[PDB]
Design a protein around this ligand. Structure first.
Ligand SMILES: N[C@@H](CCC(=O)O)C(=O)O
Ligand SMILES: [Zn+2]
Length: 258
């Protein structure tokens, strides 16, 4: 009856509300995905419960164990009915879960501490002074692991063998490493998160160069779910009405601190 929604604490998508300890259920959270969940639910005609993914991950299949972790895993093993998060539509995921058409368009980009002598991915690859990494488990990490393009293969080769590790557990961890490294650490993350951080105090980071690829985030459901068709139509209806753009403006730029 009540649709269990799996999501992830990733700003500005889902964040803990100021006085959440005094609130209950869905009212404990706020963010772009919280506003979107409320809308997809209204339009699809269902009651839901927001749940933060237990392992705090997006979703990857473990090569040795074959188990799916993160939000994807919660959908695959039936722990959740739908995932409303900045979850990238990829081929390996679409083979096990269903995705609506994209609700947000993005691409991998570079986050530097202001003043870092880096203008592109080619620049990162051609040097060693400045370290660079990605989110440990996710679509960005896989983009480099599977890239046939020379510049990205070179970047991956360095990243996988770099010590100490250049990969981080969460986006926030990557952002702090950038901020605390005096320009000695650049971070590869999706343009959406980069643009969000670029508008947050201490206003010391910046997105550089173009996007490395083009892709989208989709609302995910288990393969052959009943909700699939309706949520896809809701995403299309809401994009066409201007809500998705309105929501990105609200959480990224309207509340900008820089
Ligand atoms: N949106 C990504 C996580 C962030 C990243 O990989 O940079 C995913 O669904 O895996
Ligand atoms: Zn509406």
């Amino acid at each position: 009856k009540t649709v269990v929604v799996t999501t992830i604490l990733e700003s500005p998508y889902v964040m803990m509300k100021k006085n959440h300890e005094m609130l209950e259920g869905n009212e404990r959270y706020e963010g772009y995905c919280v506003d979107l969940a409320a809308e997809i639910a209204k339009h699809c005609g269902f009651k839901y419960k927001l749940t933060i993914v237990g392992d705090g991950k997006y979703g990857a299949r473990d090569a040795d164990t074959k188990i799916w972790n993160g939000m994807v895993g919660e959908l695959v093993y039936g722990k959740a009915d739908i995932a409303i998060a900045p979850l990238t539509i990829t081929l390996v995921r679409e083979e096990v879960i269903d995705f609506s058409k994209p609700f947000m368009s993005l691409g991998i980009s570079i986050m530097i501490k202001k003043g870092t002598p880096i203008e592109s991915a080619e620049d990162l690859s051609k040097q060693t002074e400045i370290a660079y990494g990605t989110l440990d488990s996710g679509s960005t990490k896989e983009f480099f692991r599977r890239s046939k393009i020379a510049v990205f293969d070179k970047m991956w080769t360095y990243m996988r063998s770099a010590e100490p590790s250049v990969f981080v557990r969460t986006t926030a961890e990557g952002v702090a490493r950038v901020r605390k490294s005096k320009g000695k650490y650049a971070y590869l993350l999706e343009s959406t998160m980069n643009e969000y951080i670029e508008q947050r105090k201490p206003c010391d980071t910046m997105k550089v160069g173009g996007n490395l690829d083009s892709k989208g985030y989709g609302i995910a459901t288990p393969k052959g779910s009943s909700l699939g068709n309706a949520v896809n139509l809701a995403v299309l209806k809401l994009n066409e009405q201007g809500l998705l753009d309105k929501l990105k403006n609200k959480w990224w730029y309207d509340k900008g601190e820089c």
